[PDB]
Amino acid sequence: TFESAKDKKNPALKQITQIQQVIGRNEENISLTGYYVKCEGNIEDWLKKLEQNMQQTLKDIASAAAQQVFQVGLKEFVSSQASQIALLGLQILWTSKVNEGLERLSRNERNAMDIKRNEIKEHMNILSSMCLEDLNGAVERTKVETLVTIQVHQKDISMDLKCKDVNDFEWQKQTRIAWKTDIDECIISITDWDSPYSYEFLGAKERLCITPLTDRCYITLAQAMSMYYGGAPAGPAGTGKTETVKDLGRTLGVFVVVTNCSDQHRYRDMAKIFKGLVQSGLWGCFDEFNRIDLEVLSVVAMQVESITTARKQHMKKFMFPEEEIEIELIPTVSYFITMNPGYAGRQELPENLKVLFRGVSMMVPDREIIIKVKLASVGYLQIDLLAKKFNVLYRLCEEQLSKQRHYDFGLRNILSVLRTAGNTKRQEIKSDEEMLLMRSLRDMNLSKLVADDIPLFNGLLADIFPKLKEVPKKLYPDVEKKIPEEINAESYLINTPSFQLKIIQLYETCLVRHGFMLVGPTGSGKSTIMKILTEVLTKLGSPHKIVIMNPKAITAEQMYGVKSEISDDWIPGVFSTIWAKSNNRALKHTTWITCDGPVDAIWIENLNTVLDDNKILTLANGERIAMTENCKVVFEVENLNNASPATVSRCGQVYVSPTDLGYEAVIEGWIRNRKASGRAEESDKLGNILRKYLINMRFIELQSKECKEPMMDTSPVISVINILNLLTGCLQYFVQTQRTLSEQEYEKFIVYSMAWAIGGIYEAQDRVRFHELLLAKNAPIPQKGKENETVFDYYVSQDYLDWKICSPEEWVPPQSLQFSQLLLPTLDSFRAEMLLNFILTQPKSHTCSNSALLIGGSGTAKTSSVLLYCNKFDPQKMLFKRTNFSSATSPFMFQSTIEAECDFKVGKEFAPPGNKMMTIFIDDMSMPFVNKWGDQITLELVRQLIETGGFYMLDKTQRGNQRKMKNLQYIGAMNHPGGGRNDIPNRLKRQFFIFNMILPLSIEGIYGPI
Amino acid sequence: YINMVLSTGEIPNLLAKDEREVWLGDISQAYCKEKNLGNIDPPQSELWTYFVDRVRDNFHIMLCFSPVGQKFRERARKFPALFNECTIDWFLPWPE
Amino acid sequence: SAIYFTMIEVSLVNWMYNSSLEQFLKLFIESIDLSEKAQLPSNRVKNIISFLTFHVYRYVNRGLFEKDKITFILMMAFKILTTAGTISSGDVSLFLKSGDALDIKSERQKQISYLEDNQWLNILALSKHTFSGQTLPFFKELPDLISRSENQWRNWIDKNDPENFPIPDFAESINQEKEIGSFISLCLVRSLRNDRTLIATQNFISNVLGKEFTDPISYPIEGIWQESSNMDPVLFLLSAGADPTSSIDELAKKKKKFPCEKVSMGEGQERVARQVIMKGFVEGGWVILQNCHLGLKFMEEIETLVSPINQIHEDFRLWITCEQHPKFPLGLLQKTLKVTNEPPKGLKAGLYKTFTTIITQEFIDKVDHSNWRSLIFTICFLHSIVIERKKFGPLGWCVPYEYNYSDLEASLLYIEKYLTNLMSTPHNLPISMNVVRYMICEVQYGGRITDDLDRELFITYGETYLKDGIFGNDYFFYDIMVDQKFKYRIPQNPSAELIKYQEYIAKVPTVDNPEVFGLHSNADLTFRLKESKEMINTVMETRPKDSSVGGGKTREEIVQDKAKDMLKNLPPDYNDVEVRELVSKLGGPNPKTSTERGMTVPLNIFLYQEVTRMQRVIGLVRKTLQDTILAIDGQIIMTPEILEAINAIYDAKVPNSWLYDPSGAEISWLLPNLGSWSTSLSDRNKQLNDWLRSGQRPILFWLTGFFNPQGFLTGMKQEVTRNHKKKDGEAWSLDDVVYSTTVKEREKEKDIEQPPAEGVYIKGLYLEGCKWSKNGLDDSDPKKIFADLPILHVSAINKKMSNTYLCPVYKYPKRTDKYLIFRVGLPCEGSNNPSHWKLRGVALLCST
Ligand SMILES: Nc1ncnc2c1ncn2[C@@H]1O[C@H](COP(=O)(O)OP(=O)(O)OP(=O)(O)O)[C@@H](O)[C@H]1O
Ligand SMILES: Nc1ncnc2c1ncn2[C@@H]1O[C@H](COP(=O)(O)OP(=O)(O)O)[C@@H](O)[C@H]1O
């Protein structure tokens, strides 16, 4: 603060009256009540004056405060004073109590210490209660927290002190601050070493939780100073060696100059700092000093050695190395080195240095104590009990539960728990302290857990908190009523308890966070829950929209928008434009932005600022867009495997497990859909047969045991979805002619559609075992055939309903024949033609996407058997385009081809020429490059394109606007995975119907006519 | 590019769209005669499919690779149908 | 030629050791001239050989640290015997490995009580080996002769000096072959009583190279100067805590160069050195360069600067002093004369070094009270003892922290401050409150100590050296029967004299009896084993990778046969889906009344987790083995991991791939020997496979055999607490329960027929340093290490002392904090304190 001084005489000159330390928007103001700094012409002479007057003011203030604290209540005292002093004023009080208490124990006044401990607990009780008041500003929050982080340490020591005299060692060990009336100065004793408080203005600074290790570390650093040896704490990274040195300085009221040492530092660079320390009388620690080059350290060593020598003899002045004059030494100099053994940097220090610095090895701070402080800093009592429990759970549940990526039981989640555990404590103070924590642990971790691990956790929870019988959940009566009412509106959605629970959990995490994600395997109905929750919220007050994009389907540069290399003009980003439109307080739109594709290190890092509490999206052109209350971010990630542990902890992850929306629940859903289509009798019968084979006996679980090496690895739900698709297609003929069938006739259908959806993927050896399993369970099968006859050879005819051997249509020689371009009807092509005909003829539904992918061996006639199917298309009725994928092919290459191929439009929607319903064949679908993360970029677009029926236009002019292709069908061929070739992403698999083409047992039928 | 050429029979966006209609014009008189003397004016989409087939009949790729060079083993895995579509004659070490 | 290729083999051990070919020719040429001139041609040749070997050994041995001095002369001895037909590469290969490759499951049973299981596999190797120029195996039927009830064989193994005595039954035949006989007698000793190999090799080296090689040379600095010229500098290699700069100045005084130029190398000292060396070059004078390894840039420059092209005065001698450094300039090492000044590292010598150097007459006068001088001795005595603990290895200290003289100075500089405050105050003894002393001397040294269990050991040293009774004249620390018996007293000086401390130190014995460090007489056998394993582990890294081993089998063909024999012994790969069907069947603890099943039960969950980890290991081993058999035949290219695996398998070490994953986390148990690793795999798995298939869990759990023993015990801990929720009173929480631990003390292990109601009954833990007598702990039997513990009964006490030892169970003998499992209350009731077991280094080991 600068004030107008000497206005009457020698004007324009300015006077400094007050010091400001600003954190964020708030400030800690120490006014100089007298000792006004008159700032003369020469800058260095008034800056010296300033540093003296600051130090003069604190002394005067702290000299008044040390008198005040004894004859004033602690709540009243701490609020009045400035952070640094309040800390000093608390520590002084505490010592004067223990001294006074111990004095009485030596004179033999019994329970004198007990009386003092009772006053210290009252002191602690007030500070914990001051966290609960939630006073405004970052400064005043920091001030109260640091006080609490000290006070626990005071209470902890004094509680288990057990000394009969003041001069007994165990009390001497403890850090002791006292105001000596005789010498009129603050003195801070550690063991036998008395330093006078330097009275540097610190302000409100974050203090580290004081461990029993740290109390034994201070001592050594202290002893190191008294003997004039340097101090140098060595330990693994994250212990905060730097922080603990700084802690000791802030204790003593002395500034610490931190110097982030590196390879670039020279002996000249270092020499300047030391000369700075010795002339100023300030401490000067060096962060990561090992990372200095060994060449430099030999020179530095002589520099430290020369400083040491001078300090030992009590020399007022000494000659520094490479200095001509003798420089003034202040007695209160201390230089420290934060090093790292098991170095990530350079080899151990020189033989000269080792001598000059006394080490302190620092282990990892015991997690329990960190929690204990934090719980007290929130406004809990009986922290020591809770902290142990809280620790024991987390440490134990990490080692017992399954090692999944979205689980975090390190400090990141612990601190996240304790701020919500705290926001619960403030509102309901009367509630028991254990139950509040126990609840706050529960409601956060439950949403994260996989189905297998919920029983394990609810055990661990019960085991540590056996006093707490049962805890009531947040009822949420508004939303709970609406889900059943909402679900019944669509024909194809069933309502299970497991599923409805997983919706609620998504709505619980929706309210408190902005960046909640939704993790789960393929076809666990994440896409559905999203859609429901929003459709439920739409009906209660404000409407909710969802915007589906695929971050992987577009390049990082193209999503966020970057500077164009040509004409130097800014192209708008896809996400930026969606984000911008979405972030406007107009007609309570509350639009969610979802990122379907898998999270990777690359793309989220730009979006990392939004997910954090800042909530501002940076495009890196200077522009920063603020997130409005209404707009939110979601992620429909499967795995969450290839993401940093930091970015995970920001977002609130709900996990939807396979067992939530079971394949039973989809089947029962599909059957309910058939009754709303107007055909109740058919549905009634299909149910009695579907149930028999799929839920009553676990056919998919039994099949997967007896048959080994399935050529494509698929989940059970996928195989059931494919069953229903194929079953629909088969019966689609009987929908048009309104023909109900007998139980026998549907049974034949279902076992056909089971055999090809479930047992398709299998190879020839396994097709037999599969066919031999159907016989054991008394399904209808073709009774009579030849040797190595299988279900797969037969199909159920539409005209008359029984099993018929599929003989391929008789070949007609196509006039002039070249053996090369001659393709014939074969047994393989027909079965391929047939299954393809079932999937692609079906109308677009929830289950099907009108898309079939056929896997197979290399040159097993995949490519041919599609080209045979894609002939006999009436050019007016249906079109046929073929693109060939390859390791080179990128999403933009595939996007540009489909974008060019269907340019006809119907209002907003796009279409192929006229209205043909063009079927896009994608040969060699596996080939595109799999990156280190294990996600195929182009295929994520393919999946986006099939599922949503649209991607985002990438032409510079139009960005953040969907292009939707009203009618398209997709056939894939790919060489089956294993042996270094790429597997297709699980997410994509579900979209496609899949079956394995095989090498024929007799090519006689193929080449016999030629 | 030669892998792509061998499997597809075509390259996507190889030649200018106006240059198609000139090429296909010459192709038509052989095509109408080759297809059992059809002798009707073909459309430009049907003509393309014949020309592509014609290309593959006339265009032979001869690849001459080293088996010992580490890249060879990678190329087979990296390019499908560069190995599995063309016939492989292997050259043994010279006999006595 | 042989010798020169030995010097190249030494280059692989340490970068600093390597000498040029051009330096070798100088020794070799000089060697011919200096040798005795014979009239007879064969005598003349004989003379040159005997001289050359020595004259080169002497040279190299000077530039070799103490630990590797014995390895080099052993390499040389083999290299000589490998050229002639006395030793083939297989014979050398045997000595180093000696059937650590073999696995007890495949081979014969042991059948003898007094042999260890390793010793038996080491025998079996000798049984199958033919050596060189011999039809059938020499040591075929050795396992029959030892299995024979002849006390001669037992007596030979239990003798303090086995190698010195003749072999009980085989001695006659060994005497007949002179050239190979010495080597096959060494490979017996390596097999049985491995610990005495360093002493055996010296007997072996003596018969091969002559007596003179075993005698210590101990070059004086005058000899180093005399060898050295003006153009060839003298490079000193420095082990940490050594400084030879004072020794140069001592020699300089006799050569009238005492006031010499000294230059502490670093950054920006290159311009100071140039100036200083140019004065030396013309004027004459010695130039000592300290800490040269730091200023690496000047060391490439100095090679060309000190070359003959620049004019150098004949008096001028360059001295470089630098600690060993990787990527030192080769060019310099090829010109220079290499010397290694290492601390003599005996207790006597360690004491002597402190009193001669950092203790002075000035120092012992600073406080001027009897107690200060008396304390000085204690701290300095302690300091030297605490160093010599590091010899013993993991028994000595879990982690070896190089305690510099700094630690001693600071701890003494502390005592001045304290005693000056008591001296200021009006039997004439100060108060010297030894509670303060303990802590602060165990803070200043504590600054290095990273491990919690090494700290508590140090603390205990404090409580046995810095007690209140050291100021009285009749207190003598340890009164040991080293030679009759030496007292190890604090010397008493009526008038403070440095001479009378030094005078006492001369009386102290040269050989340090283990009793001085609180350890047992068996501690030295563990010490000798480690430094012998260390030697063998160094000479293995040198060995050539040449396929032609001899005996009609190639290196790759030996690896093949071992990779094929391993694959058949491996257990079948667990099916994840099938295991979950087996796990869902499993019962709980107290399985009659429990009525609980499935993955919900805390030990069953744990069993699943460690079954899936076991499979993950088997699967990795399975994969690699198959690829190695393919890689040698030329079916697949050799990957970087497969080459490393093949190399490891040849020399019966476990492939680094199977010990650690790419990330660095531990995937399978750490054993050194592949053979012992593959017996564990087949035993670890069997327990998991016996438990998983069967309904009932093992009566006596084998704690070693689990991947996470810490997780298993927390497993058990959970089970008991769940049984005790109805019990009262109090409700049991994982918060506020700890382990209750008792020993069974049963004559047999098979007397245990039913599990305990609450506990586990762990078996196969081994006591290090000590035995179990059934009256608590008791001093171990002579020449019996790692005495077996009975069945340990672990439970939960539920929270709620002197003469109760809080022993730690370690997962391995390496005993770092990582492999600490859990502490165990061992009573130790009669006669012996718990603080006396902590100095004896008592621990329970799972592994060995
Ligand atoms: N509650 C329900 N009742 C009946 N059918 C459902 C239910 N929830 C989802 N389904 C159907 O099951 C299929 C699951 O698709 P959904 O997109 O909901 O899962 P998803 O987790 O998003 O799958 P992916 O991870 O592949 O996107 C859909 O066809 C959907 O219509
Ligand atoms: N019905 C058929 N008529 C003629 N040839 C066929 C038939 N089915 C397969 N083939 C031959 O089998 C080979 C299989 O390869 P292809 O069908 O091109 O696709 P893929 O190699 O991907 O399986 C082809 O080269 C083709 O000539």
XYZ file of C-alpha atoms in Angstrom, chain A residues 356-732:
377
model
C 29.487 -30.185 5.166
C 25.829 -31.497 5.341
C 24.284 -33.756 8.067
C 21.661 -36.003 6.361
C 18.131 -36.854 7.594
C 16.558 -39.865 5.796
C 12.779 -39.175 5.469
C 10.409 -42.184 4.910
C 6.880 -41.718 3.362
C 4.658 -39.748 5.841
C 2.388 -42.293 7.684
C -1.020 -41.907 5.882
C -3.099 -42.220 9.143
C -1.755 -38.874 10.575
C -2.357 -36.969 7.260
C -6.062 -38.108 7.408
C -6.270 -37.331 11.198
C -5.185 -33.653 10.654
C -7.519 -33.323 7.605
C -10.523 -34.719 9.624
C -9.733 -32.120 12.387
C -9.255 -29.344 9.718
C -12.849 -30.182 8.544
C -14.387 -29.885 12.075
C -14.528 -33.518 13.367
C -13.603 -34.517 16.972
C -12.195 -37.997 18.042
C -10.040 -37.834 14.824
C -7.499 -40.453 16.188
C -10.239 -43.192 16.161
C -11.790 -42.250 12.729
C -8.352 -41.731 11.039
C -7.196 -45.294 11.959
C -10.556 -46.810 10.746
C -10.555 -44.654 7.551
C -6.866 -45.664 6.837
C -7.363 -49.408 7.676
C -10.363 -49.648 5.231
C -8.557 -47.917 2.301
C -5.182 -49.752 2.751
C -7.067 -53.115 3.104
C -9.742 -52.634 0.340
C -6.900 -51.882 -2.194
C -5.323 -55.361 -1.542
C -8.646 -57.369 -1.349
C -10.712 -55.807 -4.263
C -9.890 -56.414 -8.000
C -7.097 -54.153 -9.435
C -9.228 -52.022 -11.847
C -7.989 -48.627 -13.200
C -11.011 -46.441 -12.152
C -10.377 -47.552 -8.474
C -8.167 -45.032 -6.545
C -7.391 -45.769 -2.811
C -4.386 -43.374 -2.568
C -4.542 -39.855 -0.990
C -6.260 -38.204 -4.068
C -9.585 -40.058 -3.329
C -9.044 -39.756 0.495
C -8.860 -35.892 0.326
C -11.879 -35.958 -2.116
C -13.828 -38.041 0.512
C -12.876 -35.746 3.438
C -14.162 -32.473 1.785
C -17.600 -34.177 1.072
C -17.407 -35.954 4.506
C -16.896 -32.369 5.799
C -19.704 -30.655 3.783
C -21.950 -33.363 5.430
C -20.552 -32.648 8.994
C -21.289 -28.835 8.843
C -25.039 -29.197 7.960
C -25.752 -32.036 10.532
C -23.406 -31.365 13.560
C -25.663 -33.367 15.994
C -25.258 -36.623 13.910
C -22.649 -39.187 15.208
C -19.136 -38.589 13.703
C -18.507 -42.263 12.633
C -21.859 -42.702 10.744
C -21.303 -39.366 8.822
C -17.830 -40.506 7.604
C -19.031 -44.171 7.140
C -21.933 -42.843 4.955
C -19.600 -40.404 3.046
C -17.103 -43.284 2.322
C -20.030 -45.511 1.203
C -22.045 -43.263 -1.201
C -18.845 -42.233 -3.191
C -17.036 -45.643 -3.577
C -20.278 -47.705 -4.299
C -20.874 -46.079 -7.751
C -17.188 -46.939 -8.689
C -17.288 -50.667 -7.719
C -17.737 -53.564 -10.232
C -20.549 -56.084 -9.325
C -17.980 -58.718 -8.062
C -16.408 -56.254 -5.519
C -19.591 -54.693 -3.890
C -20.051 -57.743 -1.542
C -16.286 -57.620 -0.593
C -16.505 -53.837 0.203
C -19.847 -54.104 2.172
C -17.956 -56.776 4.214
C -14.891 -54.502 4.896
C -17.305 -51.598 5.712
C -19.236 -53.822 8.251
C -15.935 -55.251 9.673
C -14.334 -51.864 10.731
C -17.707 -50.179 11.703
C -19.553 -53.006 13.593
C -21.263 -50.374 15.903
C -23.162 -48.967 12.850
C -25.875 -51.610 12.061
C -27.463 -49.844 9.002
C -27.305 -46.343 7.334
C -30.204 -44.734 5.358
C -29.432 -43.695 1.707
C -30.521 -40.319 0.162
C -34.136 -41.362 -0.735
C -34.518 -39.046 -3.827
C -38.347 -39.551 -3.990
C -39.000 -37.218 -7.049
C -36.705 -39.162 -9.529
C -37.403 -42.683 -8.043
C -41.163 -42.450 -8.944
C -40.543 -41.173 -12.549
C -38.148 -43.959 -13.837
C -40.803 -46.790 -13.856
C -43.403 -44.345 -15.397
C -40.778 -43.221 -18.015
C -39.429 -46.759 -18.865
C -43.004 -48.019 -19.730
C -43.325 -45.320 -22.544
C -40.830 -47.252 -24.811
C -41.787 -50.830 -25.890
C -38.196 -52.254 -25.546
C -37.081 -51.174 -21.981
C -37.513 -53.482 -18.923
C -37.105 -52.084 -15.325
C -34.902 -54.248 -12.989
C -33.820 -53.257 -9.422
C -30.022 -53.448 -10.313
C -30.583 -51.117 -13.352
C -32.842 -48.512 -11.578
C -30.218 -48.413 -8.756
C -27.477 -47.607 -11.394
C -29.673 -44.716 -12.782
C -30.122 -43.154 -9.281
C -26.304 -43.462 -8.726
C -25.744 -41.581 -12.058
C -28.221 -38.853 -10.851
C -26.468 -38.668 -7.386
C -23.068 -37.993 -9.123
C -24.819 -35.635 -11.676
C -25.923 -33.182 -8.893
C -22.536 -32.623 -7.065
C -19.980 -32.877 -9.997
C -20.043 -31.352 -13.551
C -17.758 -34.018 -15.181
C -19.357 -37.379 -14.085
C -18.435 -40.262 -16.479
C -20.130 -43.692 -17.061
C -17.816 -46.767 -17.272
C -18.823 -50.386 -18.165
C -18.348 -53.267 -20.684
C -20.034 -53.395 -24.141
C -23.885 -53.467 -24.098
C -24.252 -52.857 -20.319
C -26.860 -50.199 -21.336
C -24.799 -47.072 -20.491
C -26.172 -45.322 -23.664
C -29.718 -46.212 -22.310
C -29.305 -44.980 -18.639
C -27.955 -41.634 -20.001
C -31.080 -41.440 -22.276
C -33.510 -42.394 -19.404
C -32.011 -40.120 -16.642
C -32.291 -37.160 -19.100
C -35.846 -38.228 -20.220
C -36.682 -38.407 -16.417
C -35.111 -34.931 -15.680
C -36.962 -33.495 -18.788
C -40.337 -34.304 -17.075
C -39.170 -32.768 -13.694
C -38.701 -28.978 -14.252
C -35.846 -28.263 -16.752
C -35.312 -30.152 -20.080
C -31.982 -32.082 -20.544
C -30.432 -32.658 -24.033
C -27.489 -35.065 -24.765
C -24.870 -34.345 -27.525
C -22.962 -37.556 -28.576
C -19.501 -37.019 -30.166
C -16.532 -39.420 -30.610
C -13.263 -37.672 -29.558
C -11.127 -40.511 -31.075
C -13.083 -40.355 -34.430
C -11.499 -36.856 -35.037
C -7.784 -35.777 -34.718
C -6.907 -33.878 -31.448
C -6.036 -30.768 -33.580
C -9.376 -30.918 -35.539
C -11.581 -31.517 -32.389
C -10.275 -28.481 -30.367
C -9.423 -26.322 -33.449
C -5.828 -25.113 -34.225
C -4.043 -22.403 -36.320
C -4.181 -23.176 -40.114
C -0.733 -23.470 -41.850
C -2.179 -21.738 -45.035
C -3.513 -18.077 -44.953
C -2.829 -17.891 -41.102
C -6.588 -17.779 -40.107
C -8.155 -19.646 -37.087
C -10.390 -22.683 -38.000
C -13.103 -23.284 -35.318
C -12.756 -26.591 -33.347
C -15.557 -29.251 -33.307
C -15.660 -29.491 -29.448
C -15.120 -25.683 -28.981
C -18.205 -24.920 -31.199
C -20.375 -27.582 -29.390
C -19.012 -26.296 -26.003
C -19.781 -22.628 -27.014
C -23.397 -23.298 -28.285
C -23.922 -25.515 -25.156
C -22.590 -22.831 -22.688
C -25.375 -20.136 -22.865
C -27.904 -19.272 -20.055
C -30.964 -19.160 -22.424
C -34.187 -21.281 -21.921
C -32.711 -23.629 -19.188
C -31.392 -26.024 -21.941
C -28.859 -27.806 -19.538
C -27.192 -29.725 -22.462
C -24.777 -32.623 -21.599
C -21.670 -33.056 -23.858
C -20.736 -36.804 -24.025
C -17.430 -38.207 -25.448
C -18.340 -41.828 -26.486
C -14.757 -42.833 -27.535
C -12.136 -44.168 -25.055
C -10.175 -41.591 -22.915
C -6.444 -41.322 -23.901
C -3.611 -39.070 -22.526
C -3.574 -37.003 -25.816
C -7.110 -35.532 -26.235
C -8.261 -35.059 -22.537
C -5.085 -32.991 -21.631
C -6.443 -29.934 -23.609
C -9.890 -30.522 -21.905
C -8.186 -31.100 -18.446
C -8.911 -27.463 -17.265
C -12.755 -27.926 -17.720
C -12.843 -31.184 -15.611
C -11.047 -29.331 -12.713
C -12.852 -26.765 -10.408
C -11.656 -23.841 -12.687
C -14.313 -24.948 -15.304
C -12.794 -22.911 -18.233
C -11.945 -24.488 -21.666
C -8.682 -23.133 -23.282
C -8.237 -23.369 -27.134
C -4.572 -22.085 -26.822
C -5.215 -18.958 -29.034
C -5.564 -16.743 -25.872
C -9.398 -17.318 -25.801
C -10.810 -18.952 -22.581
C -14.568 -19.956 -22.555
C -16.320 -20.040 -19.098
C -18.581 -23.091 -18.323
C -22.197 -22.074 -17.378
C -24.021 -23.908 -14.474
C -26.496 -25.608 -16.929
C -23.908 -27.311 -19.275
C -22.125 -30.590 -18.207
C -19.514 -33.102 -19.562
C -19.910 -36.949 -19.696
C -17.781 -39.894 -20.972
C -19.184 -43.310 -22.160
C -15.711 -44.974 -21.800
C -15.569 -48.827 -21.648
C -12.260 -49.391 -19.808
C -10.723 -46.062 -18.570
C -7.371 -47.978 -18.657
C -5.091 -45.656 -20.719
C -5.764 -42.424 -18.715
C -3.496 -40.782 -16.036
C -4.514 -41.392 -12.357
C -4.870 -37.551 -11.872
C -7.544 -36.847 -14.608
C -9.658 -39.848 -13.292
C -9.888 -38.425 -9.681
C -11.336 -35.077 -11.024
C -14.425 -36.782 -12.633
C -17.115 -38.793 -10.720
C -17.148 -42.360 -12.184
C -20.310 -44.568 -12.044
C -19.597 -48.184 -13.153
C -22.364 -50.167 -14.947
C -21.497 -53.914 -14.668
C -22.727 -56.676 -17.055
C -25.134 -58.064 -14.346
C -26.929 -54.630 -13.955
C -28.797 -54.869 -17.334
C -28.440 -58.666 -17.853
C -28.997 -60.347 -21.277
C -32.173 -61.766 -19.562
C -33.310 -58.091 -19.160
C -32.603 -57.373 -22.906
C -34.364 -60.655 -24.044
C -37.411 -59.883 -21.782
C -37.171 -56.304 -23.209
C -37.134 -57.660 -26.830
C -40.187 -59.941 -26.073
C -42.084 -56.982 -24.489
C -41.336 -55.074 -27.795
C -42.953 -57.911 -29.869
C -46.252 -57.517 -27.822
C -46.412 -53.691 -28.507
C -45.907 -54.448 -32.293
C -49.478 -55.979 -32.186
C -48.465 -59.721 -32.173
C -48.992 -60.856 -28.516
C -49.532 -64.647 -29.236
C -46.158 -65.045 -31.095
C -44.307 -63.202 -28.226
C -46.008 -65.421 -25.534
C -44.662 -68.585 -27.317
C -41.150 -67.180 -28.168
C -40.799 -66.364 -24.401
C -41.525 -69.975 -23.268
C -38.746 -71.176 -25.738
C -36.137 -68.317 -25.353
C -36.302 -68.716 -21.497
C -35.906 -72.563 -21.770
C -32.523 -72.385 -23.643
C -31.013 -69.040 -22.400
C -32.018 -68.358 -18.686
C -33.287 -71.796 -17.321
C -30.152 -73.643 -18.584
C -27.193 -71.208 -19.107
C -26.615 -72.227 -22.776
C -24.009 -69.459 -23.430
C -22.072 -70.407 -20.203
C -22.332 -74.197 -21.063
C -21.398 -73.624 -24.774
C -18.299 -71.495 -23.795
C -16.920 -74.360 -21.553
C -17.362 -77.338 -24.006
C -16.067 -75.459 -27.156
C -12.489 -73.979 -27.057
C -10.630 -71.293 -29.133
C -13.574 -69.119 -30.374
C -12.060 -67.260 -33.395
C -13.459 -63.870 -32.184
C -13.734 -63.337 -28.364
C -17.284 -61.921 -27.648
C -19.199 -61.171 -24.374
C -22.390 -63.190 -23.534
C -24.770 -60.141 -24.077
C -23.319 -59.535 -27.614
C -24.094 -63.197 -28.601
C -27.723 -62.820 -27.233
C -28.268 -59.457 -29.070
C -27.116 -61.260 -32.308
C -29.575 -64.164 -31.484
C -32.539 -61.725 -31.193
C -31.421 -59.899 -34.429
C -31.285 -63.174 -36.429
C -34.536 -64.522 -34.795
C -36.294 -61.193 -35.793
C -35.050 -61.508 -39.412
C -36.209 -65.177 -39.711
C -39.761 -64.382 -38.413
C -39.879 -60.993 -40.333
